[PDB]
Enzyme design. Structure first.
Site, PDB file in Angstrom:
ATOM      1  N   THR A 145       0.835  -1.192   0.000  1.00  0.00           N
ATOM      2  CA  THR A 145       0.000   0.000   0.000  1.00  0.00           C
ATOM      3  C   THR A 145       0.873   1.247   0.000  1.00  0.00           C
ATOM      4  OG1 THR A 145      -1.758  -1.180   1.177  1.00  0.00           O
ATOM      5  CG2 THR A 145      -1.806   1.223   1.229  1.00  0.00           C
ATOM      6  N   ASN A 206      14.768   3.879   8.276  1.00  0.00           N
ATOM      7  CA  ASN A 206      14.443   3.140   9.494  1.00  0.00           C
ATOM      8  C   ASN A 206      15.685   2.640  10.218  1.00  0.00           C
ATOM      9  OD1 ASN A 206      11.746   3.231  10.152  1.00  0.00           O
ATOM     10  ND2 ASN A 206      11.176   1.399   8.989  1.00  0.00           N
ATOM     11  N   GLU A 254       9.616  28.843   2.529  1.00  0.00           N
ATOM     12  CA  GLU A 254      10.805  29.668   2.361  1.00  0.00           C
ATOM     13  C   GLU A 254      12.070  28.831   2.496  1.00  0.00           C
ATOM     14  OE1 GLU A 254      10.188  33.467   4.347  1.00  0.00           O
ATOM     15  OE2 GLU A 254      12.350  33.838   4.345  1.00  0.00           O
TER      16      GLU A 254
HETATM   17  N1  LIG Z   1       9.211   3.776  11.043  1.00  0.00           N
HETATM   18  C1  LIG Z   1       8.208   2.922  10.868  1.00  0.00           C
HETATM   19  N2  LIG Z   1       8.250   2.022   9.826  1.00  0.00           N
HETATM   20  C2  LIG Z   1       7.230   1.146   9.639  1.00  0.00           C
HETATM   21  C3  LIG Z   1       6.133   1.142  10.489  1.00  0.00           C
HETATM   22  N3  LIG Z   1       5.290   0.174  10.063  1.00  0.00           N
HETATM   23  C4  LIG Z   1       5.825  -0.426   8.974  1.00  0.00           C
HETATM   24  N4  LIG Z   1       7.031   0.169   8.706  1.00  0.00           N
HETATM   25  C5  LIG Z   1       7.972  -0.141   7.617  1.00  0.00           C
HETATM   26  O1  LIG Z   1       7.282  -0.143   6.384  1.00  0.00           O
HETATM   27  C6  LIG Z   1       7.668  -1.240   5.584  1.00  0.00           C
HETATM   28  C7  LIG Z   1       6.478  -2.165   5.412  1.00  0.00           C
HETATM   29  O2  LIG Z   1       5.429  -1.453   4.801  1.00  0.00           O
HETATM   30  P1  LIG Z   1       3.971  -1.336   5.475  1.00  0.00           P
HETATM   31  O3  LIG Z   1       3.561   0.099   5.716  1.00  0.00           O
HETATM   32  O4  LIG Z   1       3.938  -2.128   6.761  1.00  0.00           O
HETATM   33  O5  LIG Z   1       3.038  -2.039   4.361  1.00  0.00           O
HETATM   34  P2  LIG Z   1       1.609  -1.440   3.923  1.00  0.00           P
HETATM   35  O6  LIG Z   1       1.737   0.045   3.655  1.00  0.00           O
HETATM   36  O7  LIG Z   1       0.584  -1.707   5.004  1.00  0.00           O
HETATM   37  O8  LIG Z   1       1.256  -2.234   2.561  1.00  0.00           O
HETATM   38  P3  LIG Z   1       0.663  -3.732   2.528  1.00  0.00           P
HETATM   39  O9  LIG Z   1       1.628  -4.651   1.813  1.00  0.00           O
HETATM   40  O10 LIG Z   1      -0.648  -3.725   1.777  1.00  0.00           O
HETATM   41  O11 LIG Z   1       0.465  -4.226   3.944  1.00  0.00           O
HETATM   42  C8  LIG Z   1       8.802  -1.931   6.318  1.00  0.00           C
HETATM   43  O12 LIG Z   1      10.013  -1.372   5.870  1.00  0.00           O
HETATM   44  C9  LIG Z   1       8.575  -1.530   7.754  1.00  0.00           C
HETATM   45  O13 LIG Z   1       9.805  -1.488   8.439  1.00  0.00           O
HETATM   46  C10 LIG Z   1       6.081   2.048  11.544  1.00  0.00           C
HETATM   47  O14 LIG Z   1       5.116   2.059  12.308  1.00  0.00           O
HETATM   48  N5  LIG Z   1       7.125   2.936  11.726  1.00  0.00           N
END
Ligand SMILES: Nc1nc2c(ncn2[C@@H]2O[C@H](COP(=O)(O)OP(=O)(O)OP(=O)(O)O)[C@@H](O)[C@H]2O)c(=O)[nH]1
Ligand SMILES: Nc1nc2c(ncn2[C@@H]2O[C@H](COP(=O)(O)OP(=O)(O)O)[C@@H](O)[C@H]2O)c(=O)[nH]1
Ligand SMILES: [Ca+2]
Ligand SMILES: [Ca+2]
Ligand SMILES: [Cl-]
Ligand SMILES: [Mg+2]
Lengths: 440, 68, 421
Positions: A145, A206, A254
């Site tokens: 997503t 991250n 700015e």
């Molecule tokens: N910093 C941070 N990174 C996150 C978090 N949740 C997921 N991630 C990172 O995002 C990546 C995974 O993407 P997600 O956002 O979990 O996936 P999605 O957007 O739900 O898409 P789907 O495949 O449909 O589940 C990985 O690199 C995770 O480390 C969060 O709460 N904080």
């Protein structure tokens, strides 16, 4: 007037939105039920915090925000959590089936089923604005997503709002917390498709956040909660100029004027200080000079790279708290005579400074100490291309064997989109080299 | 002449913004259409293979029937 | 969200019944369908495998299939036999006589439509079906032939859903029936084309574990299925409990299957009946694999590791990095970060900590080579072929299945030999 609309996409975007809006409410004195006792104009106003919150006649301050996810389990925790009353139900949009870490499912197969509804709710927010300034889009590079639906939404937003400003907060993948092997594929696809539609993107590595939490906060195994509270502090530093007023407060637009020399070169490196535990902070007051020095230590960067082996095209310091220009100028003078700060020859070497007087807040039960002053540096450095290089190398390693590509082709993507996106990334790396070469 | 140039500059800004919107719209339409076509084609090939399997099973039961 | 479970044949129904017993205990469900657990974590994703009925009863989303009534009658009399939906028992009378052709083309073909009625009824009441998991053996007739036929038919009706199998591989060490290499090769031929992920439960490995490691001189099917149930609970933990990694069948497949045909997984378990380094080292030990393959004879394309119990996540991360850095030669360098690790706080029954391993290793070619050797030794002398040609089959079908499995082995070899530079 000057409203900003926030869009949080996928798990990472939604949870970082959770942290950010809790921090905003704490910074503005907004209770979880949306009430703000200090706001004496009921149902409206043009205060600075109204750039991010609208107001109901009942006195509730509502985020100008949409939460979007293709599966419901993360947004359901918003719907049932502490700040559930903050949002109207129509701001929290969920599907039933996620994109399974597949850009193609996020952009095409599943995303196409919810994109019109999401745009409709965004239109409902935009119609409440007397002078919309643009959008802030929070998402991961790696998720299905976060990558594909974000790319779809950005394209559609360019169509529905022309050149209206769109800023990104993009979560760059790290093996310590990553959940998909194909995250390099998703990263390169979404960066290629979004590049034309984003005016400014703040990448958050991250791994950098993970290491900052471990090293400076002594968290053995940081969780998404730790990472997101830190990330929300950085985001708040960036949006404070839009949410607060002041006589030394410089607007983010700015800063952006200085930070984007070429439309494609719109990826600032963010550095934040101080990140300190309350046990270490106790009886240790960090000065303006100390935190400004900390801005030039790579260990404090939002993206792992070495600016010392690159060139600067812009340098912005965004102070919040007990900070005066005299101390800022002293610290900057000290740093110039002592640091490896090399600019490209076609840009002025000055530092652009903004100061917001309202001090930083921390979420109760967090790891960050409450400090009297903090600073976020936004610099345009050629070193940020290192992150693109690492991502592209992982991409190349997998794509040389067409590993996992069948998952994307099965959803209707062609190999040509892979090769086209990778060529766009190669051209981007080339652009960063060229901007760093000296003039003749 | 200066006024004429001012009108030209603002009309050019409008034209470039509108052309950006138009080309974005058209590229997105092309991508979604090509993608729908490709995914439907893959599903169709899959189901065709499965129907060939069903036809072969019919053939097998026929071959057993004429063995008696 | 919802998974539909199907168990076919004798082996399929026995290991499925044990699977349901184990995970019903884990989720606090008693044999009457009532919840009596102590942690809300047990109920958060209960809907993946259980339907909820009136009186807050939980009913397995399970379909029981066989061409003979015996094993399913014994299931209905088993400990959790009354927990299953009675209409979800679909059985015939003819039997399959350990004949893949009878299971796939004739008897099973007569029975398959009544199975599909129940499959359709279960799927229609799913909020958002992810797909199906099938338990069966490849050595018999009903599980093997009719299971693969069911896979093809279900795939015809649900082409965009994930198809997952737990497939028991035959071994001379366990069963003497001579036509098992034929049945297994014919089954593998179907699985390569029509499943998305297949856990190879190798009876050879189960026997060797019970004999050498567990010191069971005369291992029974009970002893083998104890290992099978522990492994299945391990590999479905990420589907059954809240979590970030491989939390559904499609995300698991996307993480595990770099090429559509190479979807045959080597499962492993530890401990076989304490510290995190010991758990990790044993879970990567060949002697802990449920497929009779030495991973050090090949290279890992992808690995999923699941740790269960209360333990230091820092130590888990350190040990996983340790094994990868110290055995890097055995992980393909052209798939970066191909080992993913999940941790669930809830341990299995009787253990304080455990580890489950899911490897997509090119060493699985040793299993397929074993099956192909036993197949060819019989096929070149055309032994027992009349059992199959008598059901309408052609020798060309045997030749093609042999060819396809040999191709699978050669493809594993190609990617084992592939290099990044
Ligand atoms: N910093 C941070 N990174 C996150 C978090 N949740 C997921 N991630 C990172 O995002 C990546 C995974 O993407 P997600 O956002 O979990 O996936 P999605 O957007 O739900 O898409 P789907 O495949 O449909 O589940 C990985 O690199 C995770 O480390 C969060 O709460 N904080
Ligand atoms: N691990 C295990 N293997 C079994 C079991 N029952 C049968 N098998 C094997 O499965 C093969 C025969 O398959 P079977 O299910 O009995 O025939 P079917 O009922 O006609 O499908 C043989 O290789 C048996 O060794 C069991 O309960 N546990
Ligand atoms: Ca007001
Ligand atoms: Ca039997
Ligand atoms: Cl905080
Ligand atoms: Mg999600």
């Amino acid at each position: 007037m000057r409203e900003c609309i926030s869009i949080h996409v996928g798990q990472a975007g939604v949870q970082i939105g959770n942290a950010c809006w809790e921090l905003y409410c704490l910074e503005h004195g907004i209770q979880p039920d949306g009430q703000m006792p200090s706001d004496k104009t009921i149902g409206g106003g043009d205060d600075s915090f109204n750039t991010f919150f609208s107001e109901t006649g009942a006195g509730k301050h509502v985020p100008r925000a949409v939460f979007v996810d293709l599966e419901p389990t993360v947004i359901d925790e918003v719907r049932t959590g502490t700040y559930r009353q903050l949002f109207h139900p129509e701001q929290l949009i969920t599907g039933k089936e996620d994109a399974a870490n597949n850009y193609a499912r996020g952009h095409y197969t599943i995303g196409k089923e919810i994109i019109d509804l999401v745009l409709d709710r965004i239109r409902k927010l935009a119609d409440q604005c007397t002078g919309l300034q643009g959008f802030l889009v929070f998402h991961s590079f790696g998720g299905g997503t976060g990558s594909g639906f974000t790319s779809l939404l950005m394209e559609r937003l360019s169509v529905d709002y022309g050149k209206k400003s769109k800023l990104e907060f993009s979560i760059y993948p790290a093996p310590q917390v990553s959940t998909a092997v194909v995250e390099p594929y998703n990263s390169i696809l979404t960066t290629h498709t979004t590049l034309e539609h984003s005016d400014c993107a703040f990448m958050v590595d991250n791994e950098a956040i993970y290491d900052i939490c471990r090293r400076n906060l002594d968290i053995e195994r940081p969780t998404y909660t730790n990472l997101n509270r830190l990330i929300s502090q950085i985001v708040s530093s960036i949006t404070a100029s839009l949410r607060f007023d002041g006589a030394l407060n410089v607007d983010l637009t700015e800063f952006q004027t200085n930070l984007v020399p070429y439309p494609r070169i719109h990826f600032p490196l963010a550095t934040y200080a101080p990140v300190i535990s309350a046990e270490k902070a106790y009886h240790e007051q960090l000065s303006v000079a100390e935190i400004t020095n900390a801005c030039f230590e790579p260990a404090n960067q939002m993206v792992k790279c070495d600016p010392r082996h690159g060139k600067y095209m812009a340098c912005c310091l965004l102070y919040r708290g007990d900070v005066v220009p005299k101390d800022v100028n002293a610290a900057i003078a000290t740093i110039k005579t002592k640091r490896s700060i090399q600019f490209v020859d076609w840009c002025p070497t000055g530092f652009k400074v903004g100061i917001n007087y309202q001090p930083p807040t921390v979420v109760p039960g967090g790891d960050l100490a409450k400090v009297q002053r903090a600073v976020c540096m936004l610099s345009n450095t050629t070193a940020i291309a290192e992150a693109w290089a690492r991502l592209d190398h992982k991409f190349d390693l997998m794509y040389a064997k067409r590993a996992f590509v069948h998952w994307y082709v099965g959803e209707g993507m062609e190999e040509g989109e892979f090769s086209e996106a990778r060529e766009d990334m190669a051209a981007l790396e080339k652009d960063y080299e060229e901007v760093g070469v000296d003039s003749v | 002449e200066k006024r004429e140039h001012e009108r030209e500059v603002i009309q050019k800004a409008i034209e470039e913004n509108n052309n950006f919107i138009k080309m974005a719209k058209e590229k997105l339409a092309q991508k979604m259409e090509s993608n729908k076509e490709n995914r439907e084609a893959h599903l169709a090939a899959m189901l065709e293979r499965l129907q060939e399997k069903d036809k072969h099973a019919e053939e097998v039961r026929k071959n057993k029937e004429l063995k008696e | 969200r919802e998974i539909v479970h199907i168990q076919a044949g004798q082996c399929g129904n026995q290991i499925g019944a044990k699977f349901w017993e184990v995970i019903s205990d884990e989720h606090g469900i008693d044999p009457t369908g009532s919840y009596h657990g102590d942690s809300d974590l047990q109920l958060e994703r209960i809907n993946v495998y259980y339907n909820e009925a009136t009186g807050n009863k939980y009913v397995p989303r399970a379909i029981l299939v066989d061409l003979e009534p015996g094993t399913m009658d014994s299931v209905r009399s088993g400990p959790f036999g009354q927990i299953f939906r009675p209409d979800n028992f679909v059985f015939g009378q003819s039997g399959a006589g350990n004949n893949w052709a009878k299971g796939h083309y004739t008897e099973g073909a007569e029975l398959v439509d009544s199975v599909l009625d129940v499959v359709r009824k279960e799927s229609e009441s799913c909020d958002c079906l992810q797909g199906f998991q099938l338990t069966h053996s490849l050595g018999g007739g009903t599980g093997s032939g009719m299971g693969t036929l069911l896979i093809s038919k279900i795939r015809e009706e649900y082409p965009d859903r994930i198809m997952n199998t737990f497939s028991v591989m035959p071994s001379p060490k366990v069963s003497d029936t001579v036509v098992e290499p034929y049945n297994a090769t014919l089954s593998v031929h179907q699985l390569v084309e029509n499943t998305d992920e297949t856990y190879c439960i190798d009876n050879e490995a189960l026997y060797d574990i019970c004999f050498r490691t567990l010191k069971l001189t005369t291992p029974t099917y009970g002893d083998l299925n104890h290992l099978v149930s522990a492994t299945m609970s391990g590999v479905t933990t990420c589907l059954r409990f809240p979590g970030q990694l491989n939390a559904d069948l499609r995300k698991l497949a996307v993480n595990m299957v770099p090429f559509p045909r190479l979807h045959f997984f080597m499962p492993g378990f530890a401990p076989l009946t304490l510290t995190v380094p010991e758990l990790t080292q044993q879970m990567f030990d060949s002697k802990n694999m449920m497929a009779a393959c030495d991973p050090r004879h090949g290279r890992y394309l992808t690995v999923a590791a699941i740790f269960r119990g209360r333990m230091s996540m820092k130590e888990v991360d350190e040990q996983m990095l340790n094994v990868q850095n110290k055995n890097s030669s055995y992980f393909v360098e052209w798939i970066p970060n191909n080992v993913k690790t999940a941790v669930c706080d809830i341990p299995p029954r009787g253990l304080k900590m455990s580890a489950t391993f899911i490897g997509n290793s090119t060493a699985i070619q040793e299993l397929f080579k074993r099956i192909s050797e036993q197949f060819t030794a019989m096929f070149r002398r055309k032994a027992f072929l009349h059992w199959y040609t008598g059901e309408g089959m052609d020798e060309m079908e045997f030749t093609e299945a042999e060819s396809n499995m040999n191709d699978l082995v050669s493809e594993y070899q190609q990617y084992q030999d592939a290099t990044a530079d």
